[PDB]
Amino acid sequence: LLSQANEAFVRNDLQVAERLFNEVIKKDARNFAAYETLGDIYQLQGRLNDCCNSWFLAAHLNASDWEFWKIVAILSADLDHVRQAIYCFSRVISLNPMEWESIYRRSMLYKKTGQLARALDGFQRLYMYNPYDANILRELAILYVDYDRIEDSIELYMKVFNANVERREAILAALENALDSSDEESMFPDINWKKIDAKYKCIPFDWSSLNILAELFLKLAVSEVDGIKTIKKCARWIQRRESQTFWDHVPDDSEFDNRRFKNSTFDSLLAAEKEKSYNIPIDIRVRLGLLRLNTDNLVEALNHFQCLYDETFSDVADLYFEAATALTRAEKYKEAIDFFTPLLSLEEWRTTDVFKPLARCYKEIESYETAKEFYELAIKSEPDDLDIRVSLAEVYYRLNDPETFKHMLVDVVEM
């Protein structure tokens, strides 16, 4: 009777006679080739769900054949069948705890679902077994952030930083010893560098990594000074100025600014250490501004923000906003308005997000006449918020027009 399998499968190669497999399955489902082929066939006929189904049940008779369960998993995943994918993957990993694609996708799906721990175990294991992959680091860091565990997330990057430092020092020491020792002779030591490149194979620590680190430091909001110091240090290891230790002992944030010219130890340096990159990317400077703002150091923060004017506006309109908001949150309105106002130039930024805080800023300054405007613009584009109406209502009260104020409140209380 089994022959009917073979007779069919070969003769079903072309067309719908394949759906006569469905007669072969009825007598006994336990045969694999039937389901597997049925899946192979549905995969070809175009219909995906029936296929995925066939493959799933197919998978269940060769339990521990995880190379198949993986396929079922990814297929289920692409079909937006999450729990199926997670389940199949989970078994694939239960059987083979060293399939990183599966663990990755599964952990991503866990991250999606909300089971952050289950994802975190995976990403931990993944990073552990592959510390030279930036995306894994990013994701694991993000997970650590979502877990209110920023410290680990920061240590994660500081490790990479220190690794880069070690690498640099190793290279320099190597070529130094080689060069100096050689120069005593005429030749040059046959020294191995692949050993150097391997033994010190860190993830490259560039400005992006530092920006991420900065963001992580902002998200921390605890002992921001140490953060700023670290940012400056790493930013100073970049630009190859780590030799300059004294910058660690100045709070002025004098470096990365012209003020450095007024420093005593600086002027004493050789022009070789000078003429080096002292300028940082704006993406980081702003964050230093914010991190400075966190410490009620408005002066430096503003000195950092003031560098936004020099940059081409459109390329950093996103940062003006952040800078503007942080100032409102910092009860610094007179300064916030200066960074809110330029956004009005671009149409895309004419939204409530910019109109509320502006209005509040002008409200708090006791220049209500101009706050009224933006509150009206905020409500206009677009309705509605209770609090905004109440704010505008403040404006009307403090404008000695409580009648209107009240009528507004009573107008909005209804809906």
Author numbering: 131 to 316, 337 to 565
Reproduce passages from the article.
Recruitment of Pol III to these genes requires the essential transcription factors TFIIIB and TFIIIC2. The six subunits of yeast TFIIIC are partitioned into two DNA-binding subcomplexes (τA and τB). The binding of these intragenic promoters by TFIIIC permits the assembly of TFIIIB, upstream of the transcription start site, which subsequently leads to the recruitment of Pol III, the formation of a PIC and finally to transcription. A genetic study suggests that the two largest TFIIIC subunits, τ138 and τ131, are responsible for connecting τA and τB16.
Given that our crosslinking data implicated the TPR array of τ131 in connecting τA and τB, and the reported importance of this region for TFIIIB assembly, we determined the crystal structure of the TPR array (residues 123–566) in two different space groups (P62 and P43). We were able to collect diffraction data up to 3.15 Å (P62) and 3.4 Å (P43) resolution. The lower-resolution structure was solved by multiple isomorphous replacement with anomalous signal (MIRAS), using anomalous signal from crystals prepared with selenomethionine substituted proteins or native crystals soaked with p-chloromercuribenzensulfonic acid to final Rwork/Rfree values of 20.9%/24.5% The higher-resolution structure was solved using selenomethionine substituted protein in single anomalous dispersion (SAD) experiments and subsequently refined to Rwork/Rfree values of 25.0%/28.7%. The structure reveals the presence of 10 TPR repeats, while only nine TPR repeats had been predicted. Rather than forming an extended super-helix, the TPR array is instead separated into two ‘arms' by a central region that contains an extended helix and a disordered coil we call ‘ring' domain. This insertion causes a bend in the TPR array, positioning the TPRs of the right arm closer to the TPRs of the left arm. A superimposition of the two crystal forms and an analysis of temperature factors reveal flexibility at TPRs 1–3, 8–10 and residues at the extremes of the extended helix. Surface analysis of the TPR array shows that the inner groove is lined with patches of conserved, often acidic surface residues that may bind to the predicted basic surface residues of τ138. To our knowledge, this is the first time that a loss of interaction by both of these mutations has been probed directly using purified proteins. These results suggest that the binding hotspot for τ138 thus overlaps with that of a binding site for Bdp1.
